[PDB]
UniProtKB/Swiss-Prot annotation, chain A:
Component of the MCM2-7 complex. The complex forms a toroidal hexameric ring with the proposed subunit order MCM2-MCM6-MCM4-MCM7-MCM3-MCM5; loaded onto DNA, forms a head-head double hexamer. Interacts with CSM1. This is Minichromosome maintenance protein 5. Acts as a component of the MCM2-7 complex (MCM complex) which is the putative replicative helicase essential for 'once per cell cycle' DNA replication initiation and elongation in eukaryotic cells. The active ATPase sites in the MCM2-7 ring are formed through the interaction surfaces of two neighboring subunits such that a critical structure of a conserved arginine finger motif is provided in trans relative to the ATP-binding site of the Walker A box of the adjacent subunit. The gene is MCM5. GO terms for cellular component: chromosome, telomeric region; CMG complex; cytoplasm; DNA replication preinitiation complex; MCM complex; nuclear pre-replicative complex; nuclear replication fork; nucleoplasm. Changing K329A: Loss of MCM2-7 complex helicase activity.
Curated annotation (Swiss-Prot), chain B:
GO terms for biological process: DNA replication initiation; double-strand break repair via break-induced replication; mitotic DNA replication preinitiation complex assembly. Belongs to the CDC45 family. InterPro entries: CDC45 (IPR003874). Present with 1730 molecules/cell in log phase SD medium. The keyword Cell membrane does not apply. It is found in: Nucleus. This is Cell division control protein 45. GO terms for cellular component: CMG complex; DNA replication preinitiation complex; nuclear replication fork; nucleus.
UniProtKB/Swiss-Prot annotation, chain C:
GO terms for biological process: DNA strand elongation involved in mitotic DNA replication; DNA-templated DNA replication; double-strand break repair via break-induced replication. Keywords: Cell cycle, DNA replication, Nucleus. It is found in: Nucleus. The gene is PSF1. Present with 1431 molecules/cell in log phase SD medium. The keyword Transport does not apply. Component of the GINS complex which is a heterotetramer of SLD5, PSF1, PSF2 and PSF3. Interacts with PSF2. The chain holds residues 105 to 208 of 208 of the full protein. One of its GO terms (cellular component) is nuclear replication fork. Belongs to the GINS1/PSF1 family. The lineage of its organism: Eukaryota, Fungi, Dikarya, Ascomycota, Saccharomycotina. Required for DNA replication. Functions as part of the GINS complex which plays an essential role in the initiation of DNA replication by binding to DNA replication origins and facilitating the assembly of the DNA replication machinery. Required for the chromatin binding of CDC45. This is DNA replication complex GINS protein PSF1. It comes from Saccharomyces cerevisiae (strain ATCC 204508 / S288c) (Baker's yeast). Its main location: nucleus.
UniProtKB/Swiss-Prot annotation, chain D:
Its main location: nucleus. It holds the Pfam family Sld5. Keywords: DNA replication, Nucleus. GO terms for biological process: DNA-templated DNA replication; double-strand break repair via break-induced replication. Belongs to the GINS2/PSF2 family. The gene is PSF2. Functions as part of the GINS complex which plays an essential role in the initiation of DNA replication by binding to DNA replication origins and facilitating the assembly of the DNA replication machinery. The lineage of its organism: Eukaryota, Fungi, Dikarya, Ascomycota, Saccharomycotina. Component of the GINS complex which is a heterotetramer of SLD5, PSF1, PSF2 and PSF3. Interacts with PSF1 and SLD5. This is DNA replication complex GINS protein PSF2. One of its GO terms (cellular component) is CMG complex. InterPro entries: GINS_A, GINS_bundle-like_dom_sf, GINS_Psf2, PSF2_N. It is found in: Nucleus.
């Protein structure tokens, strides 16, 4: 019970791992911060005392208050009002547990776990302190929630006639905190079997809140327990779990460590800094580097130009993977999702149950209304993967026509008409009709009928798979090497050792980059390009002199413009290069060729 | 054949210089037993602030590439692990240089038999025979004093027979299994103890150094526990805690196990990747697999609890663990596991078994990193070497965790590849001896390290034969990936199930010399280690037939 | 400079042509100007190195793929890749500047 | 051209400075050395107290041929009256060895062995006084104005690290007001 | 004349040196004899060590110990010299402008070591050689001058004596400037009144008003 406090206080002070102790440092470190927080390493904790760990592990919930009320003690020593209790977060990475198995045994047992959150509730208050007075006796009192597992745990005492419980709330004098109410779901990969994945509500309080984006892959710890609630039986209570602490895989969060910038600067210096990424995207993949290259330019985010008037350049473009199966484009986008920090893989229809249209749904209780969400909103300001785009129902397919440009969706459903913002960069993988012969046809006569669908698209790719013997046998064997003994997989080590991207770091690299530089083209690059498309505009119409039907827009050029900052963003340079531009031309020229066919 | 101290004292007059010194320790080569003795000695000169070179020699002939390369002002010299077999007077030559010679060489080898040229003909040596096997070993006395300087036809014919008599006698010696006597650091520590220094680190280093060959028997080591055990008695930092203390925070004796990654892994896999556990329980097969689980059914252990980290095992699970072992493991012949071998305690950073401490260091050896490629790769092993030497550092423990983890990565493929081999039944029983070869596999580059298949072979030889009647036998092994059929071939010897009645030494190493003295095509003694040899698949097949017969054993 | 025996600004300041010739002219002339001060010391200085205060006094450095030995000054330390030494701060100061030295 | 720091002193520099301070030791020893400014000494008596410069004491201690005296001011039990005196004096910083920060860091490198339970001991004790001194810096640091600073007692190490802070400050303050004149 | 104080004042102004915002007179009067004194023993110790090889067909403790005090003390002076090298580069215009002016005291060999003054003009020489060939071509008539415009400005700077600096009052007591209560001195700032000062306390203030006392060596820094 009492005085176990000082033992932590000892580890708060007595502990020094050579040459420098930590948590005692962390406290003053948080002091000027006014952080009011401590992140504990539990695996570290056992290193101090073996007893108190499991001595803590026995009923960790009850010894929770034994800390922050203790941490203030020397913190108050170091403070020398008012001083709210700090928020501790202890953490451990050691044994990770499946969501598939939660045993009632685990109640009041702290468990570290990976997780994938469905969503989180809007924040709501909890009063850590309150003052209360008899509605009768005029008797003055005060209460606190010092810690809690919602119960409700406490109520108004009835001892002031006067009664019952004449004491009443005073909010002004009372002091408060917050809770997120997370809802987390297990990793989809395993082990749902044929059954649907279980979902779980995780409790985030105070600093815990706002710390995680919805839908993100996350690692979390906390305590298994059950709340009776009411809104089951006989006398059965619904499952709930405390979150402490949550140390989530980074980011999975705009801020980052400083030395990261430098190691990237090492990458920014590389002459091959772009060209190495050309290989990184397709470790298993063979060829199609142009389309492979066309990937990255979209990866860095599109041009955002907000200067007056409110007209703004969009992002990021559009791309089409259309080609005969064996294109491995769907396999490609599966790599694409893994590469994007935030992205949505959609083969639909929609994916998986997600409305391809962000749509409206009513609140079950108290009627009302709310946005039910949409994939565009889910991934907003990021990557979009699409399959069966030709198989897409054309009606919400219509909404796609809007989503790509104006990048703001609005619906009048019920009373809520509000216009949402969508900054996502979509890419269309839809398979072409009738295999090869459509290339024998017009370039159009594929998507819907009209190419107006293509009009909204920017870089559209038609895969030509030709049966060349040497070309196949190359990747043909390349395939077997992909397999056991995973000979190709071992090749990446030397590529990891010498040069080649790890691609998770690269994601951090891009996320770094995407927020970092705002490249603005050099004046001569444009004139180089202005002189360019005017030819292309004039030349393709020379193809149009035969009344040949296929296409061209001034938006076609603007899309190319976003390619200017694209690789240039990889360069990190403040302004676009003259030389840099040219590859965009010949690369888009390869895109124009698809129109040429 | 001299007391270490005065030999060490002899370097003292040869030591301090500006520019210093000059002597150079030879790090030779792969075996860690030298490594501890280097640092203790490394620390020894630190005490005296004695400057000198530190060279991690790898290639057996590499020293010739070096000794013939950089020697200038060196007035004194010390070497490790080598010369106990082949002479550097032949290897270097030497060439007596100016009595009261300009330079002297300390030669460290724990392997026997010593070379005939070692003790007698004292030149750079300072023969290292002291103090282990003197012996005598009065046989070498007739190999020279009789040999030297060597009606008259009768006395002439009488001498030659006596010559052939001694030659016939001398012919046996030096033709014999090369074997280590004892961990060199111990005698060096004896010298270290001789000067009076005893450092808990230094003893730990002996504890460390002693551990180096512990995977292979003891053999004297079994009595060398107490020699160290006496030391743990010779040193008691305090009668009682004195908790923690936050600093020292020092080692203590514990019920150690042949169980692997005890503190550092889930107890479940801890059995699973344990080699001693392997063949005794036949771990590769599914049949005996559950039987271990049956032991948890005996141990009353939750399967998930076995999946659990050793860190978080219940104190009940802790205190009762060995008692559970006391009530269970003996049934399976697992009763010889528990060892009283010493364990360092870092407290806040945790206690560790030196055996476990060793294996992490062992992981450093193969990883954590035309004909030029091998020198380039062997150099990488040397490149990777110091990072392992860095792992010797105390404050740096965090880096150790890579090897701590990477070691777990090793056996995962180790326990993996070997069992895969088990399905094919690739062993050649032959007659004279058990024989095997690896013609194929993934990541033979990782197998390029001798220790890779060495830990593997030991994991195999005890696996293939427990015994496993009858007659524990030496194993044959080879492997190849690239570099045109290099096919590293490392020697293998049978392991007794805790019952080494005889030294039994080595044979094929002499036999490998038989073929290297033979047509010796593509065979390479380039390995410092006699047990290991490079061979082309092209010429190894006949080399095999040449290996099959004549069998020396 | 850089430092022994630099022995020259050659290979140093790789920018070279990348930097304006007028400046490379100035700097190459400038470094010669400080060499005039080298005539003044006569210390010996050795201000181009000796940035860090001495300790203590010996240290262990390992070669980085650097051979060597170029060690003619004083005595030859016999440069060998993957070889850590034990040596005083003095001579180390030059080789550390020349990148031949790694660990402390 | 120093570049860095360069205006402030390096902590490595100030410790390099404090090395010059003399202290008593207990040599194992019983040419000369003449050296330069030492003036000392006759070959020193084994197991005898003698006042000598710090870094040289590190030398023989580095060979462990000497035993350094523990600072009389360094007594943790004695040091509490300072924190005692410190805890009751929100203004004054009390008394300092004035080099002591680097000392304890240096004292515990090797000479740690000479003291009675310096381990897990003063390091915490010194640490408390370190920040409580340090915290009183910032608490008084809000008063900071031109042109005068009563700095009083402080350890130069923190004085060094604080250098960039206030030196860059008042110059703004002094400039802006005087410029305002 | 005592080597300790010979060294004491060396670190004295040297500590003051890196502390100092701007340059102070070159100490040839002492530093030279040390610059010579370093030349004496260093050569001496070098040979006596050579006489040590003769005993070879014990105590190296004092041996490198001598070498120890050598390079360590040898280190500090470079910081002293190299730092002065920097300040001059910053004042070089003013240093000439202070040189060009009759009053008050020129750098000479007093304020500046002969190597320093040489480095002054030499560096300043090629520097203008560096500006002229580069930007000044292309040298507008009024812009042809490198100097006060006036404004802004330039250099002029940086005779800013106004800057505050770390100090600790210390000076030899008669048992002068001490008016009480505890100790000396004024103070009397341009914009402020007496504070004043104590040898027992560190007071940071204007580098100009304090120049007199650092000149008196009545305050540590
Ligand atoms: N460039 C390539 N790199 C690697 N693998 C390829 C490549 N091209 C084809 N393949 C192989 O061909 C197969 C294509 O299957 P996949 O389902 O990815 O086709 P897809 O193009 O995504 O289908 P769809 O055309 O309907 O979108 C894969 O097994 C893949 O390994």
């Amino acid at each position: 019970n009492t005085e176990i406090i000082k033992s932590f206080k000892n580890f708060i002070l007595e502990f020094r791992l050579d040459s420098q102790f930590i948590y005692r440092d962390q406290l003053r470190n948080n002091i000027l911060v006014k952080n009011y927080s401590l992140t504990v390493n539990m695996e570290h904790l056992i290193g101090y005392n073996e007893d108190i760990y499991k001595k803590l592990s026995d009923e960790p919930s009850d010894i929770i208050p034994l800390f922050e009320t203790a941490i203030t003690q020397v913190a108050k020593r170091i403070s020398i009002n008012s001083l709210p209790t700090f928020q501790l977060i202890l953490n451990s990475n050691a044994n990770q547990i499946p969501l598939r198995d939660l045993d009632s045994e685990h109640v009041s047992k702290i468990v570290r776990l990976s997780g994938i959150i469905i969503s989180t509730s809007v924040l709501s208050s909890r009063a850590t302190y309150l003052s209360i007075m008899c509605r009768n006796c005029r008797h003055t009192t005060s209460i606190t929630i010092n810690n809690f597992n919602t119960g409700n745990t406490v109520s108004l005492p009835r001892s002031c006639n006067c009664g019952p419980d004449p004491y009443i709330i005073i909010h002004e004098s009372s002091k408060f905190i917050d809770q997120q109410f997370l809802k987390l779901q297990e990793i989809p990969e395993l082990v749902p079997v044929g059954e649907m994945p279980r979902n779980l509500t995780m409790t985030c309080d105070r600093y815990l809140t706002n710390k995680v984006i919805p839908g993100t892959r996350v690692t979390i710890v906390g305590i298994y327990s059950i709340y009776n609630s009411k809104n089951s039986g006989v006398a059965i209570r619904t499952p709930y779990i405390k979150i402490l602490g949550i140390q989530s895989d980074v980011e999975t969060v705009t801020m980052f460590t400083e030395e990261e910038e430098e190691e990237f600067l090492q990458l920014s210096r590389n002459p091959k800094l772009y060209e190495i990424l050309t290989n990184s995207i397709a470790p298993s993949i063979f060829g199609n580097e142009d389309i492979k290259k066309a990937i990255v330019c979209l990866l860095m985010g599109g041009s955002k130009k907000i200067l007056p008037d409110g007209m703004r350049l969009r992002g990021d473009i559009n791309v089409l993977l259309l080609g005969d199966p064996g294109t491995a484009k769907s396999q490609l986008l599966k790599f694409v999702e893994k590469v994007s920090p935030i992205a949505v893989y959609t083969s639909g229809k929609g994916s998986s149950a997600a409305g391809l249209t962000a749509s409206v749904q009513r609140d079950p209780m108290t009627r009302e209304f709310y946005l039910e969400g949409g994939a565009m909103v889910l991934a907003d300001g990021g990557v979009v993967c699409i399959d069966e785009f030709d198989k897409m129902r054309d009606e919400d397919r219509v909404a796609i026509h809007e989503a790509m440009e104006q990048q703001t969706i609005s619906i009048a459903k019920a009373g809520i008409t509000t216009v949402l913002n969508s900054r996502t960069s979509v890419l269309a993988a839809a398979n072409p009709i009738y295999g090869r012969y459509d290339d024998l046809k017009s370039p159009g006569d594929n998507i819907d009928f009209q190419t107006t669908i293509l009009s909204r698209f920017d870089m559209i790719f038609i895969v030509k798979d030709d049966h060349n013997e040497e070309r196949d046998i190359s990747i043909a064997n390349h395939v077997i090497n992909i397999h056991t003994g995973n000979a190709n997989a071992m090749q990446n080590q030397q590529e990891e050792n010498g040069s080649e991207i790890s691609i998770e770091k690269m994601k951090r690299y891009i996320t770094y980059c995407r927020l970092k530089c705002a490249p603005r083209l050099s004046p001569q690059a444009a004139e180089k390009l202005s002189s360019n498309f005017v030819t292309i505009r004039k030349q393709l119409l020379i193809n149009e002199l035969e009344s040949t039907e296929r296409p061209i827009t001034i938006r076609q050029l603007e899309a190319i413009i976003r390619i200017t900052e694209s690789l240039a963003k990889l360069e990190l340079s403040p302004i676009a290069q003259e030389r840099h531009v040219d590859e965009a031309i010949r690369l888009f020229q390869a895109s124009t060729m698809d129109a040429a066919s | 054949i001299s007391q270490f101290s005065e030999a060490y004292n002899k370097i003292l007059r040869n030591s301090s210089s500006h520019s210093s010194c000059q002597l150079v320790i030879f790090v030779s080569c792969l075996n860690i037993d030298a490594l501890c003795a280097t640092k203790m000695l490394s620390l020894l000169f630190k005490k005296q602030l004695v400057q000198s070179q530190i060279v991690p020699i790898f290639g057996y002939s590499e020293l010739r590439r070096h000794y013939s390369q950089l020697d200038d002002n060196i007035n004194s010299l010390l070497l490790v692990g080598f010369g106990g077999v082949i002479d550097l007077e032949a290897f270097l030559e030497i060439d007596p240089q100016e009595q009261s010679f300009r330079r002297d060489i300390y030669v460290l080898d724990a392997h026997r038999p010593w070379n005939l040229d070692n003790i007698f003909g004292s030149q750079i040596i300072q023969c290292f025979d002291d103090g282990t096997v003197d012996d005598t070993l009065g046989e070498q006395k007739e190999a020279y004093y009789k040999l030297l300087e060597l009606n008259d036809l009768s006395k002439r014919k009488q001498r030659k027979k006596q010559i052939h008599e001694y030659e016939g006698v001398l012919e046996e010696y030096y033709s014999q299994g090369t074997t280590v006597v004892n961990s060199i650091s111990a005698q060096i520590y004896s010298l270290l103890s001789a000067i009076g220094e005893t450092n808990l680190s230094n003893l730990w280093l002996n504890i460390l150094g002693t551990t180096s060959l512990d995977i292979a028997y003891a053999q004297v080591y079994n009595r060398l526990y107490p020699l160290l055990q006496d030391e743990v008695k010779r040193l008691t930092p305090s009668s009682r805690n004195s908790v923690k203390t936050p600093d020292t925070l020092t080692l203590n004796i514990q019920p150690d196990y042949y169980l692997f990654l005890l503190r550092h892994s889930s107890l479940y896999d801890s059995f699973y990747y344990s080699n001693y556990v392997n063949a005794k329980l036949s771990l590769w097969n599914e049949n005996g697999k559950k039987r271990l689980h049956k032991m948890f059914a005996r141990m009353g252990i939750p399967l998930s609890t076995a999946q659990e980290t050793w860190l978080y095992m219940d104190h009940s699970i802790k205190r009762e663990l060995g008692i559970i072992f006391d009530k269970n493991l003996d049934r399976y012949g697992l009763q010889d596991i528990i060892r009283d071998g010493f364990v360092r305690t870092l407290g806040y950073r945790g206690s560790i078994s030196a055996s476990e401490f060793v294996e992490a260091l062992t992981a450093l050896l193969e990883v954590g990193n035309s004909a030029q490629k091998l020198t380039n790769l062997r150099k990488r092993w040397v490149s990777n070497f110091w990072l392992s030497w860095d792992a010797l550092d105390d404050r740096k423990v965090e880096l150790l965790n890579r090897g701590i983890q990477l070691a777990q990565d090793l056996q995962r493929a180790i326990f993996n590849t070997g069992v895969a081999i088990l399905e094919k039944k690739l062993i050649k029983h032959l007659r004279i001896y058990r024989l095997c070869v690896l013609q194929d596999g993934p990541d033979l580059d990782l197998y390029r390290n001798p220790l890779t298949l060495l830990r593997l072979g030991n994991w195999l030889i005890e696996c293939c034969a427990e015994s496993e009647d009858k007659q524990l036998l030496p194993m044959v092994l080879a492997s190849i990936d690239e570099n045109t059929d290099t096919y590293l071939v490392a020697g293998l010897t049978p392991r007794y199930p805790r019952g080494t009645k005889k030294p039994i030494l080595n044979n094929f190493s002499m036999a490998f010399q038989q073929i290297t003295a033979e047509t010796d095509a593509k065979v390479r003694i380039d390995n410092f280690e006699s047990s290991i040899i490079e061979i082309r698949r092209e010429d190894l097949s006949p080399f095999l037939e040449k290996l099959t017969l004549s069998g020396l054993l | 400079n850089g430092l022994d025996l630099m022995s020259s600004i050659t290979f140093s300041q790789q920018d070279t042509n990348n930097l304006s010739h007028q400046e490379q002219e100035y700097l190459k002339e400038y470094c010669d100007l400080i060499t005039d001060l080298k005539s003044g010391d006569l210390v010996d200085i050795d201000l181009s190195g000796s940035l860090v205060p001495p300790s203590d006094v010996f240290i262990d450095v390992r070669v980085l793929k650097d051979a060597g030995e170029i060690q003619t000054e004083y005595g030859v330390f016999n440069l060998i890749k993957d070889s850590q030494f034990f040596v005083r701060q003095s001579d180390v100061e030059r080789l550390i500047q020349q990148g031949y030295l790694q660990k402390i | 051209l120093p570049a860095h720091l360069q205006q402030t002193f390096s902590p490595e520099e100030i410790q390099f400075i404090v090395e010059n301070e003399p202290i008593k030791i207990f040599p194992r020893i019983t040419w000369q050395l003449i050296t330069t400014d030492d003036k000392a000494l006759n070959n020193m008596v084994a197991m005898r107290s003698t006042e000598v410069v710090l870094w040289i004491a590190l030398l023989l201690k580095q060979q462990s041929k000497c035993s350094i005296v523990a600072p009389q001011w360094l007594t943790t039990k004695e040091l509490d009256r300072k924190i005692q005196y410190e805890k009751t004096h929100p203004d004054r910083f009390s008394e300092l060895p004035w080099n002591w920060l680097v000392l304890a860091r240096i004292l515990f490198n090797k000479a740690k062995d000479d003291f009675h339970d310096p381990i897990h001991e003063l390091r915490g004790k010194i640490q408390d006084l370190r920040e409580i001194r340090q915290i009183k810096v910032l608490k008084g640091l809000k008063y900071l104005n031109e042109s005068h600073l009563q700095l009083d007692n402080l350890s130069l190490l923190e004085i060094n690290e604080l250098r960039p802070f206030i030196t860059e400050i008042m110059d703004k303050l002094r400039e802006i007001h005087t410029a305002s004149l | 004349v005592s080597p300790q104080q010979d060294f004491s004042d060396l670190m004295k102004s040297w500590k003051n040196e890196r502390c100092s915002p701007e340059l102070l007179p070159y100490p040839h009067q002492l530093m030279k004899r040390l610059l010579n004194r370093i030349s004496m023993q260093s050569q001496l110790i070098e040979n006596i060590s050579m006489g040590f090889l003769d005993m070879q067909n014990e105590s190296k403790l004092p041996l490198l110990c001598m070498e120890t005090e050598l390079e360590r003390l040898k280190f500090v002076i470079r910081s002293y010299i190299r730092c002065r090298l920097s300040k001059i580069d910053k004042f070089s215009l003013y240093l000439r402008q202070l040189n060009e002016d009759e009053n008050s005291l020129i750098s000479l060999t007093d304020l500046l070591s002969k190597d320093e003054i040489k480095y002054h003009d030499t560096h300043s020489l090629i520097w203008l050689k560096l500006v002229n060939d580069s930007i000044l071509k292309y040298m507008p008539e009024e812009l042809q001058a490198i100097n006060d415009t006036e404004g802004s400005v330039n250099m002029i700077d940086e005779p800013d004596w106004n800057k505050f600096v770390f100090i600790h009052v210390n000076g030899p007591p008669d048992g002068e400037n001490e008016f009480g209560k505890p100790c000396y001195t004024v103070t009397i700032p341009d914009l402020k009144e007496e504070v004043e000062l104590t040898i027992g306390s560190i007071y940071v203030m204007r580098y100009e008003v304090i120049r007199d006392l650092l000149r008196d060596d009545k305050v540590a820094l």
